[PDB]
């Protein structure tokens, strides 16, 4: 099994910048090396083959070049669309195997988040349940903190964050937190507190509701 | 043009087998190998066999020689994956492939069959109105069991101000948000509504938004 070492894993840049790939195959494989594109929900996209042959209709900042065990990629200049994770592939000898990809991510102007909170439903208290979900949407960098102070008091039981996927538009990311809990542990407690801690402010964000106003 | 199109998600319990299928369009297919991928979202990508449809030739994959079984049908241009003896390993999206000129392997692709192997039950979403210029919108998906819920507002019309978040698995149960973000003029005064659809119990649900 010819074991292919790509570097590296992950990767930050601006639009206009170059950024480039390496991959390192275990053994020669000659020039038999294509190179693949792959966007959130989508099937990977043959960019490069034969090391260094661009495929039909991509674009002529994307470049590849290599020989034997050694290869890398190139995009001259990043757009914000190019962002995607980045797979080579040796095809010289069976089975054919790909590299662990490489995630590129774009850099972009600190952006601070839109923060808003949401009492439990109606329809779901009906069911026993009590989910309260805070939204903290388009901001940048990725990297954010969440704190449910409930009365005061800190909680880190129930609380579920989840990031979305960096938009190809803006270069935003959002993120959600959710706090589940029983009917009757929402019925104990008044003031629901989700504060975002973000480098762009010292001062954290806050948002919060009563249980009945 | 060319076409890969693979059939929807499964789920399937452990020690069991799973039979998955790519309909081919646009070409010759008796010209051409089918190829299958394996994707694990911490594994990459991995190249499991190909057949050739006609003689049904095949070829795998050292790893996936007992695991995978290739055939492809003439008569209906279908190209099939069983996989048998089934552990939570082989949850995975298996996507079929295509090769084009010469050196241009893998050119096209199907979209993609997501796998799930477990004995969890499946369950159907619940889903919760979230309500408080512009005013931010939520959707609660709570409770469902497998993999994947697809969330459209107005039926795919407000895709402007969206945001879906990925799901978490927690006791077996899955739960997402989706928020959307529209003009304060426009809501409560025109209507929006969350529609989510969950293909293993075949379940479509669709809630407005009030205040």
């Known amino acids: 099994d010819i074991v292919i070492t790509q570097s590296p894993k992950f990767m930050s840049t601006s639009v206009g910048d170059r950024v480039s790939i390496t991959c390192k195959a275990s053994q020669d494989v000659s020039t038999a090396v294509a190179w693949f594109q792959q966007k959130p929900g989508q099937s990977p996209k043959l960019l490069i083959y034969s090391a260094s042959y661009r495929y039909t209709g991509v674009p002529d900042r994307f470049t590849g070049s290599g020989s034997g065990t050694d290869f890398t990629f190139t995009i001259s200049s990043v757009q914000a669309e190019d962002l995607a994770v980045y797979y080579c592939?040796?095809?010289?000898?069976?089975?054919?195997?790909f590299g662990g990809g490489t995630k590129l991510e774009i850099k972009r102007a600190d952006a601070a988040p839109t923060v808003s909170i949401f009492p439990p439903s109606s329809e779901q208290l009906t069911s026993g349940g009590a989910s309260v979900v805070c939204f903290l949407n388009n901001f940048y960098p990725k990297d954010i903190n969440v704190k449910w102070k409930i009365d005061g008091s800190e909680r880190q039981n129930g609380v579920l964050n989840s990031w979305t996927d960096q938009d190809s538009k803006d270069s935003t990311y959002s993120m959600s937190s959710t706090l589940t809990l029983t009917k009757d542990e929402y019925e104990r407690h008044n003031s629901y507190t989700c504060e975002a801690t973000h480098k762009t402010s010292t001062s954290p964000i806050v948002k919060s509701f009563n249980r009945n106003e | 043009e060319v076409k890969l199109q693979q059939s929807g998600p499964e789920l399937v319990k452990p020690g069991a087998s799973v039979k998955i299928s790519c309909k081919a369009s646009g070409y010759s297919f008796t010209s051409y190998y089918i190829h299958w991928v394996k994707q694990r979202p911490g594994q990459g990508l991995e190249w499991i066999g190909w057949?050739?449809?006609?003689?049904?030739?095949?070829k795998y994959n050292e790893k996936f020689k007992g695991k995978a079984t290739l055939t492809a049908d003439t008569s209906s241009s279908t190209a099939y994956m069983q996989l048998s003896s089934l552990t939570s390993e082989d949850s995975a999206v298996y996507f079929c492939?295509?090769?084009?000129?010469?050196?241009?392997?893998?050119?096209?692709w199907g979209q993609g069959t997501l796998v799930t192997v477990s004995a969890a039950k499946t369950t159907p979403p619940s889903v919760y109105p979230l309500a408080p210029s512009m005013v931010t919108l939520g959707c609660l998906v709570k409770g469902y069991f497998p993999e994947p819920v697809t969330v459209t507002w107005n039926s795919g019309s407000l895709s402007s101000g969206v945001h879906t978040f990925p799901a978490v698995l927690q006791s077996d149960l899955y739960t997402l948000s989706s928020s959307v973000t529209v003009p304060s003029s426009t809501w409560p005064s025109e209507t929006v509504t969350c529609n989510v659809a969950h293909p293993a119990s075949s379940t479509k649900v669709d809630k407005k938004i009030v205040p």
């Open positions: 492939a295509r090769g084009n000129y010469d050196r241009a392997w893998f050119a096209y």
């Open positions: 592939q040796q095809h010289y000898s069976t089975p054919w195997t």
């Open positions: 057949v050739f449809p006609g003689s049904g030739n095949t």
